């Protein structure tokens, strides 16, 4: 209900808590026992990397579907930043996808 949405460009501090919405582009399976999966999420503000922690015990994210993340923390990653999903965070399936560009303008005719 009226969640505090934050844009990717707005994120510039680590440990920052807030909600983030994005589209799933591609996910790579991790052979590490700690990290479960790692990938990148598309968004009108750009692309953000994310890592799923097993301690979260949350359902796997589906490709080509939008999701709303709430109560998440930004982790430190090399020169960039990423969002870490934990049990405290929540994931909800959105029936509305995120538009990142149609690459072309269409019209009725």
């Amino acid at each position: 209900m009226e969640p505090q949405l934050t844009k990717i460009v707005d994120i510039v501090e680590n440990g920052q808590w807030a909600n983030l919405k994005a589209k799933v582009i591609q996910l790579w399976e991790n052979t590490h026992e700690s990290i479960s999966q790692v990938g990148l999420l598309g968004d009108e503000t750009g692309i953000i990397k994310f890592t799923i922690w097993k301690n979260a015990e949350l359902p796997l994210l589906e490709q080509g579907e939008s999701y709303l993340l709430r109560s998440v923390v930004v982790g430190e990653y090399n020169d960039r930043f990423q969002v870490q999903v934990n049990k405290n965070s929540s994931i909800e399936k959105l029936s509305e996808p995120i538009e990142v560009g149609l690459e072309h303008h269409h019209h009725h005719h």
Side-chain angles (χ1 to χ4, degrees), residues 1 14 44-46 55 74:
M1 293 184 289
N14 59 35
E44 186 177 13
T45 64
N55 65 354
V74 177

Side-chain angles (χ1 to χ4, degrees), residues 17-86:
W17 288 87
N19 300 348
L20 184 63
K21 174 168 62 162
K23 183 178 180 78
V24 180
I25 295 169
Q26 282 179 47
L27 28 151
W28 290 90
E29 293 294 338
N30 193 335
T31 178
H32 202 311
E33 292 177 3
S34 73
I35 294 168
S36 189
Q37 291 175 297
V38 60
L40 48 147
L41 307 172
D43 187 11
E44 186 177 13
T45 64
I47 296 170
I48 185 63
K49 293 190 292 314
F50 71 113
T51 305
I52 308 307
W53 288 98
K54 292 182 181 179
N55 65 354
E57 295 296 340
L58 305 174
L60 306 180
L61 282 64
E62 183 175 345
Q63 187 180 43
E65 290 180 2
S66 45
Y67 288 103
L68 166 56
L69 305 178
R70 289 179 291 178
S71 161
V72 283
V73 69
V74 177
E76 292 176 2
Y77 182 83
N78 296 156
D79 290 345
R80 291 176 63 87
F81 295 104
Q82 59 181 48
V83 299
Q84 292 179 5
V85 189
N86 50 38

